[PDB]
Amino acid sequence: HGIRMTRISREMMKELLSVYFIMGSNNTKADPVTVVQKALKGGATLYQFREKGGDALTGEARIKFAEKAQAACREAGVPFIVNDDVELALNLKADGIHIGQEDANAKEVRAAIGDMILGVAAHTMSEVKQAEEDGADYVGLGPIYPTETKKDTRAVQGVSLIEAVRRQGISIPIVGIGGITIDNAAPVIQAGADGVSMISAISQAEDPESAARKFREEIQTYKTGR
Numbered sequence: 001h002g003i004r005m006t007r008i009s010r011e012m013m014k015e016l017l018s019v020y021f022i023m024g025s026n027n028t029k030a031d032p033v034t035v036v037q038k039a040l041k042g043g044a045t046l047y048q049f050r051e052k053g054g055d056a057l058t059g060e061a062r063i064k065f066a067e068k069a070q071a072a073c074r075e076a077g078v079p080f081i082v083n084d085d086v087e088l089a090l091n092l093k094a095d096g097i098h099i100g101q102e103d104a105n106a107k108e109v110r111a112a113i114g115d116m117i118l119g120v121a122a123h124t125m126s127e128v129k130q131a132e133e134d135g136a137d138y139v140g141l142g143p144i145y146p147t148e149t150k151k152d153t154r155a156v157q158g159v160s161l162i163e164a165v166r167r168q169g170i171s172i173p174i175v176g177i178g179g180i181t182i183d184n185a186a187p188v189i190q191a192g193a194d195g196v197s198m199i200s201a202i203s204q205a206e207d208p209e210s211a212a213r214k215f216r217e218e219i220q221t222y223k224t225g226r
């Protein structure tokens, strides 16, 4: 995964979304980079650097942590996505950036990042359609299930939006997020999603490598079976 000179294909994007691990230093009691390394070894197909909150790293310490996480992704051959921070994504030559409804406007971000991967968090049909129009390569829909990892989230929606989007003929790459575990991931894929994203199911697992491997194995099975 080098510098992109063309927009990523939908086929490739959907493959990358399979097991999308997201993490910040304040999401685990273990060593942050070590957990990321274990998740990648287990089978995570994409990683998002999400460092925010009161006890998250800032300044130079945050940048250095990001560099080490990006290096871990490079060693595993997995793309590195930055959450919220467009400047950081450009400065590190990240593979992509993820933004939400309260962040920089998607039109503005797409113009600033060229052909880098762009993900947009959506909670309604209107937002999903707007994201596609603005040039997003994928949308993150949720929260599917209850979650305490992110407090300022909108109402839990199950797989309702995923189903509605596919029903309207929209084929944009979709990843589900919010309280997803190895036990409840199947319905997300069966509803039409191209993958599942998670923080705590892997970051707080007593065995992150095994947890990631389990996710990878079952998601592959579900995608072939739906």
Ligand SMILES: Cc1ncsc1CCOP(=O)(O)O
Pocket: 022, 142, 143, 146, 147, 148, 149, 150, 153, 177, 178, 179, 180, 197, 198, 199, 200, 201
């Ligand atoms: C970042 C984010 N965005 C919507 S829900 C969520 C949290 C996912 O965390 P967990 O997988 O631990 O529920």
Ligand SMILES: C=C1C=NC(C(F)(F)F)=NC1=N
Pocket: 020, 022, 048, 050, 083, 098, 100, 119, 120, 121, 139, 140, 141, 175, 176, 177, 197
């Ligand atoms: C709020 C979010 C929603 N979706 C995603 C992703 F999984 F990447 F799509 N990441 C986020 N940080």
Ligand SMILES: [Mg+2]
Pocket: 083, 084, 098, 099, 100, 103
């Ligand atoms: Mg955001």
